[PDB]
Design a protein around this ligand. Sequence first.
Ligand SMILES: [Zn+2]
Lengths: 5, 428
Amino acid sequence: XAXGX
Amino acid sequence: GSHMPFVNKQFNYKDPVNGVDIAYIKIPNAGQMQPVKAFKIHNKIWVIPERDTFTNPEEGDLNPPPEAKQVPVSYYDSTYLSTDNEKDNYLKGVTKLFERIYSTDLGRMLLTSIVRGIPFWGGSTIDTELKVIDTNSINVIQPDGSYRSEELNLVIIGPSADIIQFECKSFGHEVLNLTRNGYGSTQYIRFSPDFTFGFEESLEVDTNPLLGAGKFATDPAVTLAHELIHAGHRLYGIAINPNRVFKVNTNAYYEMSGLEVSFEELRTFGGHDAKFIDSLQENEFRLYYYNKFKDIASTLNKAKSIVGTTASLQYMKNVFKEKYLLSEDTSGKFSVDKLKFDKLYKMLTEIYTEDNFVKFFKVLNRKTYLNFDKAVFKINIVPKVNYTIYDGFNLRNTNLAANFNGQNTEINNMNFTKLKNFTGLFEF
Ligand SMILES: [Zn+2]
């Protein structure tokens, strides 16, 4: 689910 | 990386179903779902060009929630991927990304590990019976209209309601334990080749939640490679529980908000981020998984019979011997070799990383996982004049070839439509 912030 | 293409066939969404590699399918434990048209791009790998309203029947509705309910980094469009033309463009976009990944040595290696990563046949209540686990298959409609069960390793599907969902909102599969016990399970990846994120080329700007509009676009091949790396850990059952976290204290803004980042995400990014994984806990995890692999070897040694299949007990014992690189003595006993274990574990967790893919693609990209997103754009990588297998956005023999100009959304503006800005909204 990942991308995150 | 690829002489013969990874996806050996040009698929159109409207090609007629044949019950083999273009077929109506259902996913296990989502019974009574209407069958969905799916496309088999490679051995063990399927693509479903639909929004994901199936895997998590808590997430069955695509409509935007209340305005005052929506978080800043979220994006809703309930019509996205609703038409045949969109679905055709999705399939060709995903396909082109697999090829871009496979054309690198690193991608070739990671795709190979993934195809080889057949979820373990540990389905039996009987300890000496080898049996498939049902959740590791899909049900495919045959030309006569009956169902057959087909094992697979990987499914690419469309997003759920939140097209830029940045973390899971409840769960993976419930026996996510299969992702952490050596066994591995079939992996479902939500992904779209039609959107990407803008980031900032300066570290000080990219890691600040109040600065930057997102000048440079992330290459979607990197984003897809990121999810494939997770799928790699998860198919070999070596994912680190998400409850193992870094309480981030290396960025002031994460810290003042008490933000936590899972070791699994840091490992997946690689580079300098992976060093934030407590060395003690890293040695713990590795011993834990080694012990899981020994359990697997002894299961296969105790194996007396195999059910739910025509394949030999011996063909399948050897499939897992290869998957887990097991050693075999003169009496035919399997065992886990510490050097081979260390090699396999290292390949999956240190060689296959986001930071490593960036080097192979020669793209600009975020320098750390611990940053703040700036923007989301709509893109279209399908036309060769927009994006290619070999060069992504930074097309050779054009103005876009040098200085990452093709990722520069100011220079290559016709290739990006900005949808939403995140800067300044975060919560600070
Ligand atoms: Zn991730």
